[PDB]
C-alpha cells in the first residue's frame, strides 16, 4: 500500500478533499493564533512598558 510518507497523495486527484485538507490546515493555524494570543494575555504583565 502507500508508504507512510505518501499518505497525503490521495488528495492529488481529489479537489474537494484537497480543499477540505486545506481548510483543516487553515483551521489549525487560526486556532494556534487564537490559543497563542490567549496564553500570552494570561501571562503578560502590562504594568511597565519602560523596563
Amino acid at each position: 500500500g502507500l508508504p507512510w510518507y505518501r499518505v497525503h497523495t490521495v488528495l492529488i486527484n481529489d479537489p474537494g478533499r484537497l480543499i477540505a485538507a486545506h481548510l483543516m490546515h487553515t483551521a489549525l493555524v487560526a486556532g494556534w493564533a487564537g490559543s497563542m494570543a490567549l496564553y500570552e494575555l494570561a501571562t503578560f504583565d502590562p504594568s511597565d512598558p519602560v523596563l
Binding site: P46, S47, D48, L51
Partner: protein
Amino acid sequence: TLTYDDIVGTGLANKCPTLDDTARGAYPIDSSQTYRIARLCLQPTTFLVKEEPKNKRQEAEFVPTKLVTRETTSLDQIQGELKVNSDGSLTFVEEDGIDFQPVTVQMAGGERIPLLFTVKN
C-alpha cells in the same frame, strides 16, 4: 418632593440634593447663637488610585478606576456641631450619620481596590 416609590430603583437615592444656579447668596453667621449641620451628604463621582511604580524618581500619578459595587457609595444623613471660633472661622465636628461606605474599584488590568470611603470623626 418625590416619594420613596418615585425614587426606588432609579439610582436617585445615591445622589445628594442639589441647588439651582440661582443660589449664590450668603448665609449669615451670628456669633451670638449656636449652629449645627443638620444634614451633610457626599456623593463621589470619581475614585482615583495612586499607581505604585517600580522606582521612586518617577512621581506616581493618580489614575481613573472602575466602580464595581454599584450605587452604594454616598455618605449622608451626617450631622454635628458647627462651632464659631474666636477668629470667626467655623469648625464642623461630625457626631453621627451614614459616614462610611465600603467601595470596590478596579484598576486598568483588573486589580481590585476595596476602600472604606469615609469621613468618620
